[PDB]
Curated annotation (Swiss-Prot):
Response regulatory domain: residues covered: 17-150
In-chain residues carrying the UniProt-annotated modification 4-aspartylphosphate: E80
UniProt protein name: Histidine kinase CKI1
Assembly notes: Homodimer. Interacts with AHP2 and AHP3.
Role according to the record: Essential protein. Functions as a histidine kinase and transmits the stress signal to a downstream MAPK cascade. This protein undergoes an ATP-dependent autophosphorylation at a conserved histidine residue in the kinase core, and a phosphoryl group is then transferred to a conserved aspartate residue in the receiver domain. Required for the development of megagametophyte in female gametophyte (embryo sac) independently of cytokinin.
Organism of origin: Arabidopsis thaliana
Loss of function: phenotype: Cannot be transmitted through the female germ line. Impaired megagametogenesis visible from the four-nucleate stage, with two normal nuclei and two degenerated nuclei, leading to female sterility. Normal response to cytokinins.
Tissue: Expressed in vascular tissues of inflorescence stems and floral organs, especially in procambium cells, and in siliques.
Record's subcellular location: Cell membrane
Amino acid sequence: SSGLVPRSDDEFLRGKRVLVVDDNFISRKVATGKLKKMGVSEVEQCDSGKEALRLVTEGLTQREEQGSVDKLPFDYIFMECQMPEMDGYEATREIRKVEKSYGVRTPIIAVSGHDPGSEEARETIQAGMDAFLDKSLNQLANVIREIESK
């Protein structure tokens, strides 16, 4: 159902910027709606691993160039694991490589319709995801509090 990966709630994410990455238009609106109801300050949504990598790449650059107080363009990224073309593992890997250069690490939570198997669990770690969540997102608040202890 949900958990960490080794290396009322309506103000729960107030102050937060989130990116939702999901190839499925309906899933995607549901995710962003759920996040809005938790008081999220900005939700950004995109439909592909490549778009996500773009938005994070440009966001990091922009914040660096402006000397922004917050250097992360998103406090959390929810990343669909299985997507055509660049899946969420590969996107996460590329995000981690883009971030190296800034000395930052965005919390990236893998979203999946099923519990990972061996090989997906292995990809989850190698990619550098922080946590995993089933696509209902029921445990989203939980998982985000876990990440914040860490």
